[PDB]
Design a protein around this ligand. Structure first.
Ligand SMILES: CCCCCCCCCCCCCCCCCC(=O)OC[C@H](COP(=O)([O-])OCC(O)COP(=O)([O-])OC[C@@H](COC(=O)CCCCCCCCCCCCCCCCC)OC(=O)CCCCCCCCCCCCCCCCC)OC(=O)CCCCCCCCCCCCCCCCC
Ligand SMILES: CCCCCCCCCCCCCCCCCC(=O)OC[C@H](COP(=O)([O-])OCC(O)COP(=O)([O-])OC[C@@H](COC(=O)CCCCCCCCCCCCCCCCC)OC(=O)CCCCCCCCCCCCCCCCC)OC(=O)CCCCCCCCCCCCCCCCC
Ligand SMILES: CCCCCCCCCCCCCCCCC[C@@H](O)O[C@H](CO[C@H](O)CCCCCCCCCCCCCCC)COP(=O)(O)OCC[N+](C)(C)C
Ligand SMILES: CCCCCCCCCCCCCCCCC[C@@H](O)O[C@H](CO[C@H](O)CCCCCCCCCCCCCCC)COP(=O)(O)OCC[N+](C)(C)C
Ligand SMILES: CCCCCCCCCCCC(=O)SCCNC(=O)CCNC(=O)[C@H](O)C(C)(C)COP(=O)(O)O
Ligand SMILES: N[C@@H](Cc1ccc(O)cc1)C(=O)O
Lengths: 178, 56, 52, 69, 458, 175, 88
């Protein structure tokens, strides 16, 4: 969610992702801890049995067969962490998330409460206004002529710079806003 | 000082005056359809010792 | 809303209910049928002479 | 610790609701009081036979005082 | 009934003599007063109509329509003054003049005693609507919309005119009371069939009937907000009122001339409800909703029973209020984001809670939640159709399932989910918009409290 | 009470059994109903007595409106608009009164069904028969006139039924 | 009430606690800056198992693209703190 994706996944990445998926589904099948540990050690042995195959074609064939076996033997109802995309609390608190710009529309009577908070907010807004043009200039310099090729962004490099395009990442609402 | 107030808010009598004039014209229209007043078989009635017409 | 709620009964619902009450009382007292299938008296109707 | 909770401005909706309640009540509390006072101290008419030779006014054919008025 | 007509004609010079910054206040105040005066027409009899003069009369069918018209004028004024702020004083006065002239024409149309006077006023309503659409609409399509609005109407109404004058040469009168008392049956001949079609098609295209409805999405989408309000709430009901008036001379031909129109109405009600499920423009969805409800009204008028007539009257009133409210609700979002695409602005319940409550209530009345008068009209029509044929409950039933779906779909798309991140210009709701929503919705429930006022002469 | 006529809305003599306690335990229902009496029924009775005292000091009357009988649609010439108008108004009033008669009979039926409890199928036979007769008469008079009904269409329907009945009677006579 | 307000020190303590219960890592030789591959001599499968153990410890899932990059306990602690809005 945080890292910029690459153009493709490598063979090692696919093997590791299959290993994690297989272990998770095996834990879903093996509810008890000791049984899961036993069969997970067996699965790890089965995985590292073919770790030293120098023929890449045979390696991809083995990966293909393993993925077919996984799809046949997957748990139809695997365990999902409650806040994971399939969980029971996945987007539960999205209705409580309010963007910060709404605070600009508060009536002055509402802003009369919380004076110090709004003074700090004004300081942050001043910082963003002072940093924007330098961020844009740094992005203009660091970008190759044929446009960017990845979604990775550079850090700040100068004396008192800020990493470009930082406002909406830094001022995230919260994970439990209200 | 009522001069400025009148010249600013004299448009507020047009609609009430129109309502009154419409009521008057409706009464005038009713005045022209009395050919069967106190003459229907259902409502024909003897006049009271004082009243002249059954309705206006 | 108050003006509409207190509008006088020009639809004659209560009048019709009272008239029906009187009619039912009279007809049940004298043993007549409550309602007749004919709403017009046949003696005031002249049917065509021949049906053949 | 106590944290600031970011919400949209609730001032304007509350103001509208208060204004609507105020005006509705401003005209509807006198109406309710008047209806109650009329009902208590000027009841409904009692149905009676028409006396011989009397021609009632049209508003005399209804029973509630407000409807008659 | 000049006590209602003359004050509107007085609204005209009152608007044209007002100070430049008092036009809206004066127009709104005196429009509300005129609505209060027109409230007295609801005192109706059980036997005949209120015959004011040789020219005007009031029935139990036209009085709620007049009340709806006079109540809709101030709401239109309130909804229009936001997007007309940059306009010049003369053009604002001209816009208000168009609205006033439309109200006057509608008021005289609903109370005319003769059919030719009714026809003249019912065509005269065309000019202010067309001017409003083509002069104050926002996009380039408005011009095309105007053309679609005009000719679709006139191609229906020009035959009717001919039929009308023909009838006056045969019976000697077009007075509605004389026409009703001296009614004679229509024989089964080709001439009578074409007379029936000439008498029916103008009102059919006004409803509109499915297959003749293409003008409506264009005109109701391209119009300004007041234009859409008056097009959905009142101008569609001209067809139903005219059909219920004109059917008194078409028996017993209707007994079999209604079949193609009944089939079109039922199947096209299903079709337009289905179309509402895949719509990217929020205004077009509301327009197709209007088409489905009017198909129900057409079925009710065509089967010609007392229960169907009561249901048709109730449904017309309820739909007018509900569709006007829905158009205003969509216009608030459009004025905020300047786009009619439904999925552009999402999660608006988080940003505007009271407006979300208004959305919920409007969508609840659209799907005819009991005991709303929407549901009362729909249920009366469905019961009458069941008496007409037991199989209709299938199609009607399907409609009831689809309507709710798309209705809730609309709500779920606009109010729920997460807000769009890049839209940062959503300001809090103004007092004017909340008052507009309340003045739409409160009369609906108040009418539920006393439903016999919108059930018609039957 | 005396608010309604007891012959138009009759009720049985209301036989109810006397309490027959068989247990030494007290009856919570009796204790609760005594509390309800003393705590609810008395203040309401006093308020009603005050309201009725106020009402008695201002006694005024309203009257039931009387309509005389005008000629029916059968006695009207073909194009005589005034007689047709009066006859049509009289016919509409009669239609409303007939609807209210049916309503009274249906009220009787519903009340009997609720009153008789588990024995309603046998104990409501008379009300069911009365409703059957009234419904048949009303259906003969007014059904199928449609919207845009009038006295003339009702007369045409009655004439058609009379013609059919006369033909059936004469054909049965020839048997 | 609900769970206590997780702090950075608690997160680091639990991460180190999980790591010292792993039989392939020497407890004394382990520090908060030790690299899994260079310092500790583990391969990619061990890193996947470590990430899964962290997920079990803290009751939430770390996506694969983010989990591949974590190489020392400090990165794991920082990722968990950033995810859960921990600032103290
Ligand atoms: C909040 C705003 C926010 C926005 C919201 C939107 C708002 C929109 C509003 C739009 C405008 C709306 C206007 C509509 C106009 C309609 C007015 C109307 O027609 O009134 C009708 C009706 C009056 O009818 P009426 O024809 O005038 O009366 C005929 C008779 O002549 C009368 O009989 P009477 O001779 O017996 O006299 C009775 C008299 C006196 O009766 C009594 O005194 C007796 C009562 C019992 C007392 C007995 C015991 C108590 C005392 C004992 C102790 C003291 C005595 C001993 C002292 C010592 C103590 C021990 O009382 C009355 O007169 C009736 C009350 C008057 C109410 C009028 C309503 C007007 C409202 C208009 C304003 C609208 C806005 C609202 C604002 C209003 C202010 C809040 O008013 C009522 O509403 C009555 C309802 C109460 C009946 C009981 C309820 C039964 C429940 C059954 C259902 C159960 C299901 C559960 C649901 C329950 C939920 C309720
Ligand atoms: C049934 C209970 C009866 C209670 C007795 C007194 C009731 C007085 C109600 C007067 C009329 C309501 C005013 C309409 C505008 C809404 C107000 C507003 O803008 O919110 C600001 C106001 C300020 O709060 P806030 O903190 O700023 O939060 C606002 C946020 O936006 C978020 O606010 P929120 O989340 O709290 O939601 C606002 C609320 C408000 O939104 C609404 O939905 C209210 C509008 C009603 C739905 C309209 C379409 C349904 C068609 C049915 C028509 C019924 C009308 C009957 C005649 C009414 C006379 C005017 O919506 C809801 O809470 C859920 C709605 C689901 C309702 C389901 C019930 C269906 C019908 C069931 C029975 C109905 C017939 C009763 C008799 C049946 C036989 C015994 O909100 C409130 O105070 C809460 C509203 C109260 C809910 C009323 C729901 C029950 C009443 C239904 C009709 C009343 C019948 C009375 C006869 C006696 C029985
Ligand atoms: C924001 C907070 C909301 C919640 C809080 C609310 C607090 C409580 C308030 C809610 C009240 C609950 C309503 C319960 C009903 C009680 C009132 C009821 O009994 O009165 C009805 C009366 O209601 C009215 O009749 C209906 C109102 C009329 C509607 C017209 C609206 C005004 C015009 C506006 C523009 C028109 C646009 C639509 C065009 C068609 C009954 O009529 P009726 O049974 O006979 O009375 C018999 C005795 N009479 C005849 C002597 C009076
Ligand atoms: C897109 C939607 C537009 C709006 C929809 C409007 C619907 C209009 C449809 C008209 C309904 C019926 C019209 C006439 C009634 C019967 C028509 C005919 O088909 O029935 C038979 C008629 O018989 C034959 O069909 C002769 C007619 C055949 C010629 C008509 C052309 C129809 C072909 C389809 C053309 C499409 C027309 C619509 C264009 C848009 C009945 O036999 P018959 O008893 O003897 O005729 C009754 C009349 N009599 C008694 C005087 C003799
Ligand atoms: C729920 C039940 C369904 C599950 C069934 C699953 C069945 C599959 C079991 C067998 C699958 C295999 O072994 S597939 C065998 C695949 N073998 C190869 O690719 C050889 C080349 N080696 C490498 O790529 C790296 O060493 C690598 C291995 C990635 C380690 O990565 P690191 O060292 O850099 O961390
Ligand atoms: N057309 C109906 C209208 C109506 C409906 C309900 C009523 O309570 C009264 C009247 C008559 O009878």
């Amino acid at each position: 969610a945080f890292s910029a994706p690459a153009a493709y996944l490598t063979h090692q990445q696919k093997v590791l992702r299959l290993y994690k998926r297989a272990l998770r589904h095996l834990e879903s099948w093996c509810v008890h801890r000791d049984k899961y540990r036993y069969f997970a050690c067996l699965m790890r042995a089965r995985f590292d049995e073919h770790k030293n195959e120098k023929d890449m074609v045979k390696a991809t064939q083995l990966l293909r067969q393993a993925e077919e076996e996984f799809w046949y033997g997957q748990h139809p109802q695997p365990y999902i962490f409650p806040e994971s995309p399939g969980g029971t609390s996945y987007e539960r608190y999205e209705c409580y998330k309010v963007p910060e710009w709404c605070l600009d529309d508060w009536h002055p009577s509402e802003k009369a409460m919380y004076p110090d908070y709004f003074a700090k907010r004004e300081q942050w807004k001043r910082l963003r206004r002072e940093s924007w043009e330098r961020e844009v200039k740094q992005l203009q310099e660091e970008t190759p002529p044929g446009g960017p090729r990845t979604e990775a962004l550079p850090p700040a490099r100068k004396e008192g710079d800020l990493p470009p395009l930082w406002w909406h990442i830094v001022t995230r609402p919260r994970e439990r806003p209200m | 000082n009522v001069l400025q107030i009148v010249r600013d808010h004299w448009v507020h009598i047009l609609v009430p005056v129109g309502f009154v004039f419409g009521c008057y014209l409706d009464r005038r229209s009713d005045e022209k359809l009395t050919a069967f007043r106190n003459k229907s078989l259902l409502f024909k009635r003897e006049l009271r010792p004082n009243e002249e017409v059954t309705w206006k | 809303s108050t003006f509409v709620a207190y509008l006088p009964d020009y639809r004659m619902q209560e009048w019709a209910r009272r008239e029906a009450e009187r009619l039912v009382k009279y007809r049940e007292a004298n043993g007549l049928p409550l309602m007749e299938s004919n709403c017009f008296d046949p003696n005031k109707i002249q049917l065509p002479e021949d049906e053949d | 610790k106590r944290l600031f909770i970011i919400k949209p401005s609730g001032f304007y909706d509350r103001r509208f609701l208060k204004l609507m309640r105020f005006y509705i009540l401003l005209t509807g509390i006198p109406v309710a009081i008047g209806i109650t006072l009329v009902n208590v101290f000027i009841g409904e008419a009692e149905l009676a036979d028409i006396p011989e030779g009397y021609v009632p006014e049209h508003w005399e054919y209804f029973k509630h005082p407000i409807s008659r008025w | 009934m000049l006590k209602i007509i003359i004050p509107t004609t007085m609204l005209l010079p009152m608007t044209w003599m007002s100070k430049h910054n008092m036009i809206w206040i004066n127009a709104t105040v005196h429009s509300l007063l005129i609505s209060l005066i027109s409230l007295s027409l609801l005192n109706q009899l059980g036997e005949n109509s209120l015959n004011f003069s040789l020219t005007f009369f009031s029935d139990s069918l036209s009085a709620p329509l007049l009340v709806l018209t006079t109540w809709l004028l101030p709401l239109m004024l309130m909804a229009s003054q936001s997007h007309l702020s940059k306009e010049t004083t003369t053009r604002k006065k001209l816009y208000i003049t168009m609205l006033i002239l439309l109200q006057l024409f509608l008021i005289m149309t609903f109370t005319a005693t003769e059919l030719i006077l009714f026809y003249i006023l019912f065509e005269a309503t065309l000019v202010p609507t067309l001017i409003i659409i083509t002069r104050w609409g926002n996009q380039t399509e408005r011009l095309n919309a105007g053309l679609y609005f005009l000719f679709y109407t006139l191609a229906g109404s020009l035959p009717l005119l001919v039929a009308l004058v023909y009838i006056q040469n045969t019976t000697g009168s077009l007075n509605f009371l004389i026409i009703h008392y001296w009614s004679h049956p229509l024989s089964n001949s080709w001439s009578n069939i074409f007379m029936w079609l000439a008498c029916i098609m103008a009102f059919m295209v006004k409803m509109p009937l499915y297959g003749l409805h293409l003008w409506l999405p264009k005109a109701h989408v391209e119009a300004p907000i007041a234009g859409s309000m008056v097009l959905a709430a009142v101008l569609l009901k001209l067809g139903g009122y005219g059909m219920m008036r004109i059917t008194t001379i078409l028996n017993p031909l209707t007994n079999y001339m209604a079949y193609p129109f009944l089939m079109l109405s039922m199947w096209g009600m299903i079709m337009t409800s289905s179309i509402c499920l895949r719509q990217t423009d929020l205004k077009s969805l509301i327009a197709y909703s209007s088409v489905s409800h009017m198909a129900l009204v057409i079925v009710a008028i065509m089967i010609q029973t007392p229960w169907s007539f009561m249901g048709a009257t109730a449904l017309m009133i309820a739909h007018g209020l509900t569709s006007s409210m829905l158009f205003c609700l969509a216009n608030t979002n459009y004025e905020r984001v300047h786009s009619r695409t439904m999925i552009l602005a999402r999660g608006l319940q988080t940003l505007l809670p009271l407006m979300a409550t208004w959305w919920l209530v409007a969508s609840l009345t659209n799907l005819a939640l009991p005991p709303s008068i929407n549901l009362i009209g729909e249920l009366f029509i469905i019961t009458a159709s069941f008496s007409w044929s037991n199989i209709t409950i299938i199609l009607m039933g399907m409609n009831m399932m689809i309507t709710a779906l798309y209705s809730l779909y609309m709500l779920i798309t606009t109010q729920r989910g997460k807000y769009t991140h890049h839209i940062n210009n959503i300001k809090p709701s103004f007092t004017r918009e909340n008052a507009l929503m309340a003045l739409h919705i409160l009369p609906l429930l108040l009418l539920t409290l006393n439903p016999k006022m919108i059930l018609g002469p039957l | 009470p005396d608010s309604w006529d007891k012959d138009v809305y009759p009720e049985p003599p209301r036989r109810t059994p006397a309490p027959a306690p068989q247990t030494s335990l007290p009856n919570p229902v009796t204790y609760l109903t005594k509390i309800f009496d003393l705590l609810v029924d008395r203040p309401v009775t006093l308020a009603r007595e005050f309201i009725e005292q106020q009402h008695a000091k201002n006694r005024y009357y309203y009257y039931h409106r009387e309509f005389r009988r005008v000629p029916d649609i059968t006695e009207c010439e073909e194009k005589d608009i005034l007689c047709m108008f009066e006859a049509e108004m009289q016919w509409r009033r009669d239609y409303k009164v007939d609807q209210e008669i049916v309503n009274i009979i249906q009220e009787r039926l519903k009340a009997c069904q609720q009153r008789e409890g588990e024995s309603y199928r046998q104990n409501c036979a008379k009300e069911l028969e009365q409703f059957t007769q009234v419904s048949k008469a009303f259906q003969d008079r007014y059904s199928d006139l449609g919207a845009h009904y009038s006295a003339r269409k009702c007369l045409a329907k009655q004439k058609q039924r009379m013609l059919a009945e006369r033909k059936a009677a004469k054909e049965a006579a020839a048997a | 009430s609900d769970a206590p307000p997780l702090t950075l020190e608690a997160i680091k303590d639990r991460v180190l606690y999980v790591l010292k219960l792993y039989d392939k890592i020497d407890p004394e030789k382990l520090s908060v800056n030790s690299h899994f591959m260079k310092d500790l001599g583990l391969d990619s499968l061990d890193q996947v198992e470590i990430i899964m153990a962290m997920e079990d410890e803290f009751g939430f899932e770390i996506p694969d693209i983010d989990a591949e990059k974590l190489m020392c306990p400090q990165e794991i602690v920082d990722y968990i703190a950033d995810k859960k809005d921990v600032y103290e």
